[PDB]
Amino acid sequence: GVVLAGAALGVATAAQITAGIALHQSMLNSQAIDNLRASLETTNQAIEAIRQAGQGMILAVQGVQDYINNELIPSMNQLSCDLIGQKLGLKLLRYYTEILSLFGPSLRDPISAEISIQALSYALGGDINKVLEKLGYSGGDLLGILESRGIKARITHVDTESYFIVLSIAYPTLSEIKGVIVHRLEGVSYNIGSQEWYTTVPKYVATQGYLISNFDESSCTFMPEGTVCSQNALYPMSPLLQECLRGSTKSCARTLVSGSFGNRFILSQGNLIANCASILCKCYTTGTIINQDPDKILTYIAADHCPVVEVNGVTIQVGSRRYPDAVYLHRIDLGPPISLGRLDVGTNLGNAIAKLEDAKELLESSDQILRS
Amino acid sequence: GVVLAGAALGVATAAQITAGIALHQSMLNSQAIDNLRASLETTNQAIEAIRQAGQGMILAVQGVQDYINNELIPSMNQLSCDLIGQKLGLKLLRYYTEILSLFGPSLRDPISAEISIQALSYALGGDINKVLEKLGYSGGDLLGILESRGIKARITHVDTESYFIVLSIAYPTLSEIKGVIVHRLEGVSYNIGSQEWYTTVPKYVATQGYLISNFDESSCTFMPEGTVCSQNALYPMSPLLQECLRGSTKSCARTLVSGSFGNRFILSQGNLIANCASILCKCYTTGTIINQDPDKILTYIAADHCPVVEVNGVTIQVGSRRYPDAVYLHRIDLGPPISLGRLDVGTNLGNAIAKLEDAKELLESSDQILRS
Amino acid sequence: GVVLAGAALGVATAAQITAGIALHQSMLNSQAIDNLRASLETTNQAIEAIRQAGQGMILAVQGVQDYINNELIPSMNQLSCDLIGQKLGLKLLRYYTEILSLFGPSLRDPISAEISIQALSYALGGDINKVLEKLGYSGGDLLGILESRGIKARITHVDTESYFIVLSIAYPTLSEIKGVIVHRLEGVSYNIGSQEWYTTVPKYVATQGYLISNFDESSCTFMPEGTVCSQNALYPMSPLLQECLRGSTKSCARTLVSGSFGNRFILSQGNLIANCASILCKCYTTGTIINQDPDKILTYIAADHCPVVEVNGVTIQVGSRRYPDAVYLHRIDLGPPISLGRLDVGTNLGNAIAKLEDAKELLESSDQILRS
Amino acid sequence: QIHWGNLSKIGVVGIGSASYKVMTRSSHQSLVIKLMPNITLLNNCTRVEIAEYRRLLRTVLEPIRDALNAMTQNIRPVQ
Amino acid sequence: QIHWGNLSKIGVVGIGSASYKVMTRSSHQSLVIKLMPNITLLNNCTRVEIAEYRRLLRTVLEPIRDALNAMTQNIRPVQ
Amino acid sequence: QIHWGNLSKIGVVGIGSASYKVMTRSSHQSLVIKLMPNITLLNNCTRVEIAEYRRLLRTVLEPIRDALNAMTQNIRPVQ
Ligand SMILES: *[C@@H]1O[C@H](CO)[C@@H](O[C@@H]2O[C@H](CO)[C@@H](O[C@@H]3O[C@H](CO[C@H]4O[C@H](CO)[C@@H](O)[C@H](O)[C@@H]4O)[C@@H](O)[C@H](O[C@H]4O[C@H](CO)[C@@H](O)[C@H](O)[C@@H]4O)[C@@H]3O)[C@H](O)[C@H]2NC(C)=O)[C@H](O)[C@H]1NC(C)=O
Ligand SMILES: *[C@@H]1O[C@H](CO)[C@@H](O[C@@H]2O[C@H](CO)[C@@H](O[C@@H]3O[C@H](CO[C@H]4O[C@H](CO)[C@@H](O)[C@H](O)[C@@H]4O)[C@@H](O)[C@H](O[C@H]4O[C@H](CO)[C@@H](O)[C@H](O)[C@@H]4O)[C@@H]3O)[C@H](O)[C@H]2NC(C)=O)[C@H](O)[C@H]1NC(C)=O
Ligand SMILES: *[C@@H]1O[C@H](CO)[C@@H](O[C@@H]2O[C@H](CO)[C@@H](O[C@@H]3O[C@H](CO)[C@@H](O)[C@H](O)[C@@H]3O)[C@H](O)[C@H]2NC(C)=O)[C@H](O)[C@H]1NC(C)=O
Ligand SMILES: *[C@@H]1O[C@H](CO)[C@@H](O[C@@H]2O[C@H](CO)[C@@H](O[C@@H]3O[C@H](CO)[C@@H](O)[C@H](O)[C@@H]3O)[C@H](O)[C@H]2NC(C)=O)[C@H](O)[C@H]1NC(C)=O
Ligand SMILES: *[C@@H]1O[C@H](CO)[C@@H](O[C@@H]2O[C@H](CO)[C@@H](O[C@@H]3O[C@H](CO)[C@@H](O)[C@H](O)[C@@H]3O)[C@H](O)[C@H]2NC(C)=O)[C@H](O)[C@H]1NC(C)=O
Ligand SMILES: *[C@@H]1O[C@H](CO)[C@@H](O[C@@H]2O[C@H](CO)[C@@H](O[C@@H]3O[C@H](CO)[C@@H](O)[C@H](O)[C@@H]3O)[C@H](O)[C@H]2NC(C)=O)[C@H](O)[C@H]1NC(C)=O
Ligand SMILES: *[C@@H]1O[C@H](CO)[C@@H](O)[C@H](O)[C@H]1NC(C)=O
């Protein structure tokens, strides 16, 4: 049990506080550091496990020892002394460059920094497979954990006397969040007259009962048994976008489509949803071209009308009907057209704000208008 | 001729369907796989052509064979058997890491995935020049195609028993889209009193007749013969921004610039367009300082008034006039000021939507107010 | 003194003009190139300085000479002529790939391009430490300058006949801008009822007297002696955001936080500011739980009422009072709720502009209604 | 129809135009990545390393082969 | 409660669902990066190169060590 | 003119201040990349590889030399 002296520290982030307190538990004491220092002066191997009494095993990694043992020592009797020094100096300088890249000024706050095992690959000798094996990190979850960069390391001790760094590394355990489902949303374009439009929805959304939230896939790996994330992937969705996903089609923004587009049809529940005004749809069974009524925006193809259908030069056999026949445009409320470019957003927002501040006096005095 | 069983497949995007159906003409049949497997076992070179009789050539690439042939085998007598195994094990594990990085769970939808030849460089032995040479990929267009990542590989067959992967690779051919011109836009700041402003326009725009669209240069290479793009670079421009580029200056947004700005003059059509209120402009022929009137925002310098002009310590000789003398600020309609930072955009949009929400009742009753 | 021929050039940006004129002063003349050519054809070292009369030394770097001198030449009597050629060809092609990567069509505007010394690492033989040492670049500012990519090179001469590239490299000097302070801002969430909110502010802001500016940290390195930037990091802040930082709390946007949020307490000036409605705050001195009143949003903990406090399983001893006790929510004006997602911004901006377009006629008649 | 005259009044000029070229694929070639090296002249010096290398390769190759076989089973002759 | 019926009328469908898994760490291990190689069998052939290497390592190791010592001096026993 | 009292009421504090320093370059040095290695002691064992190396270098060197010569021809003496 330890207490942080906050008056002396003055200013500290919650992450810095939590990492600082964890140092007391994960840092080897003075006797263990002295024991570790002496052990490191007797080994000559690139990867070596240190056994220290009734304590945890410390894995010692030397980044250029494979080169010395495999390349320099065997050729010691056949190369000049200056040549041996020149070859090792090339590796030492390149090793220092990676150490500076990892532990130099680019590392903002070393105490609370979490470094992935893959970012340590060069410092560990250029590969992490043997390090993971000697640490005992194995199982059916290794690929998902490793791909999400879930194995992290923390600096706990730097020894300038004997030139070594002690890191605390952990193998995480996966826990499934109860009731959370991650949905992958895919869209197809539709035509309003001669214009091709596309609904703007997130690539992934997450649901928990009646709750809808956004999903960030940057730290996630999609494995067949579930989505494995090394950070928090759930973040709130705006109420207007939740209205879209709950059924309000007028709350869904739409964007124009370029000339060449690869999302003009999709197979869903054995049925084919196709923009037949923008691609050519033909019924292979009857040889008849499937025409899309201009008062309709999409085509829903099922076996009851076309058992085998050709779209975009691909022949697909569809199943029984799972989507109703297309409804007219006048029975669909469409959302606002938007442009997702960064400079298009700024240009249009500037126009909108200019209109609002040209009517500042009108908008503020709205209660004197409604009353009258 | 093949048919996709959509009812059994259930769900699939257009990319998966197109790539899946294409995995019937590009996939070697069961007999060619048996011939390839037996033929692979007899080779001992890093890069090999197979020549399966009256069939298109297959290029076989072994990722560590150069190391074995050039380093390990010549030193078989000098080095101990244990040392030979340790040295090869280092390269095998590093090769496995790149295979996992390329074909592991991070590869989303392997069937539909397209992998560039540069992304395969380590799997092919660390270089692709010799692979490109033996595939016959050469010509004047190679440099542009290679740089924009136009050469793509597609996974076609994975053989677990003999441990090889068959890829389908294609050398693309270029095609000019008739009538499309890609324009590069450059800007100069201007002063309104003491504030220095800058028009916000896209870096590249594309025109086709009277159509104006945005241009995405992410997958494009600008070669002297033309712009070479591996994806579709044209995407629609918002109508407000199109109005800006068609002559409506009030539709163009503008931003404030920092203290040190490097776009305060430009050379265009032999004339010098300079801010001249934020930089020093001096006429070298006569030695007088070119002064910018506060009722003008820019200075257009031509040989009629100053044959040789010194700007920002650079002496430039200009040609005949091709831009009229600057008009007054009262004859130019300027667009709305904006700020392009993400957090500035969100802060201002939230302020704008709050005003709109606080006047919902006024705006939803516009017909009543206008009638009365 | 030289003059640029603008009429012949036609069009050129400010950067191209400045870089083109500087090419007259930083380029070796015809005699020095001829002298350099002869000296290059007599050296056999990877890094070597060329001394030419009363001129600054030219540092010559050969990218594969260490491999030839250290690996191939010693093995000349042991390996066959064919094997020697095969091993050098592997390194030559890999060296070409990096030359093509750096100086190929990917390089836009080679005249004006400024290439960092780290981007040249492979072209210089795989390391820059000896190059920096031989150039004389050292001191207490080297790490800060190097980490922010402050050392840059310009292409000044390409020799096709003898196959060498001359670069102009400069070691910059650091100058402190007088009166500019860079502030790091950190936030703590707060609760309004059961909802947890978070104020949206920039990570870094810069002040100079009463001026407030944005700060871009992309090219900056935060050293203990001051932040070191290789570009201009100051850029303007929108007036609405400046109102927020000057005291107007209703001008600051706020966003909802996820379920697992890491910033729920902070240590500031020896006092603990905690969202005690979202974490368990307990006074360790008396053993009582600190409860956040629902009419307050934050808790400010000082030694006057709790000398030692447990906040998140972490025990912190706080100093004397520096932040007044929390005020009620009704004495704080909160800003608009926003969502910072890209697709949440576009969805909400499209809805807002649709309302402005529906009420266009009423907004145009801003004078015909107020004056009535 | 870019209006260059009005754009120059607010400091915008064109500094270069180029044609636009896209890519299309006509023919495809086969490239096989041979993951098993020929180690015949190395005798038995690399038995353990090769066995570990093969074991690691399986964890990557099997998921891809299953994905490929899932799609191929749904492709049928037109008749 | 995603409304798949109205979403399909504007061309939005779901193409797959998965469970959500997060990571928790229970135990930690120690991993020491030994920065000084064993050069005993290399005799004295690398004395100059090692000395330069140690000099360069200090410019990185010392600032990290000082930051670690700044935090540790503020951590007191609960007694 | 940051108002720290108002900001702390909505949970914003400053956690550190620093001075701002920029870079200016006064003197320049010359660094030449020698693309052709010295292969004198290899006894002409690398003729084919070097010839292909020089052929590949020209596809990169020539466009840059043309760009450099385009600007240099427009630079004239002041008189
Ligand atoms: C190149 O750039 C120039 C200058 O930037 C453009 O000229 C502008 O053209 C637009 C569109 O034609 C003009 O906008 C319209 O101008 C009318 C001018 O009438 C008087 O307006 C005020 C009143 O005192 C005076 O300041 C002004 O000098 C004129 O005497 C207005 O009547 C129009 O008002 C509109 O209001 C609403 C729209 O919301 C409508 O209900 C009205 O009916 C009416 O349309 C409008 O503002 C603009 O004035 C011109 N700028 C000038 C002259 O400086 C060129 O068009 C452009 N060229 C190209 C090819 O794009
Ligand atoms: C630190 O934080 C506090 C609290 O957040 C800030 O205090 C706020 O300051 C603003 C700006 O002055 C105040 O807003 C102004 O309040 C005036 C008084 O409002 C009375 O009436 C309303 C009824 O609606 C009550 O809610 C309110 O409590 C008061 O009884 C108004 O006169 C202002 O409106 C008009 O202001 C000027 C007029 O000159 C013009 O812009 C417009 O006409 C505008 O309509 C305005 O609303 C706000 O009330 C204060 N909040 C409080 C005290 O809780 C501090 O300013 C801040 N510190 C600093 C340095 O900024
Ligand atoms: C560099 O590596 C050499 C080996 O190449 C190290 O020497 C080795 O040191 C260890 C520990 O002192 C010796 O092992 C010990 O052997 C005795 C039996 O004599 C036993 O009682 C101990 O339990 C332990 O196993 C090892 O034999 C010895 N090897 C040699 C060849 O001397 C050396 O310490 C390293 N030097 C550095 C890092 O400076
Ligand atoms: C699934 O989609 C349908 C149609 O897109 C949704 O019906 C829509 O419901 C809204 C709100 O219930 C209707 O808006 C209201 O309409 C009336 C009639 O004018 C008006 O009095 C109200 O002010 C309001 O605008 C909307 O008209 C209606 N759509 C159509 C085409 O009539 C349905 O609600 C969706 N289902 C779910 C669960 O969200
Ligand atoms: C590993 O590499 C060795 C070579 O180092 C391979 O052995 C080679 O096998 C091929 C085909 O089995 C032989 O070529 C054939 O030779 C006969 C005449 O003997 C000729 O009729 C054929 O047209 C063809 O050229 C080659 O001679 C042979 N080389 C040696 C040195 O034995 C071996 O198959 C490879 N793979 C393994 C062992 O898995
Ligand atoms: C490739 O490298 C060889 C060395 O391996 C170069 O030959 C060496 O060139 C140097 C530079 O001039 C010669 O040094 C000179 O020697 C004379 C005395 O003869 C002295 O007057 C000069 O001041 C200078 O020190 C050196 O003797 C010579 N060595 C040999 C063995 O030839 C060679 O020029 C390079 N060849 C290329 C790049 O084609
Ligand atoms: C290879 O064979 C030799 C000779 O029997 C044996 O000593 C050695 O252990 C074997 N295995 C290896 C080197 O892995």
Ligand SMILES: *[C@@H]1O[C@H](CO)[C@@H](O)[C@H](O)[C@H]1NC(C)=O
């Ligand atoms: C190593 O020692 C030898 C003599 O034993 C002598 O050359 C010098 O002291 C050292 N040599 C090198 C190349 O460091």
Ligand SMILES: *[C@@H]1O[C@H](CO)[C@@H](O)[C@H](O)[C@H]1NC(C)=O
């Ligand atoms: C290359 O050098 C060798 C040195 O052994 C010598 O025969 C001659 O200069 C050259 N030989 C050939 C075959 O070009």
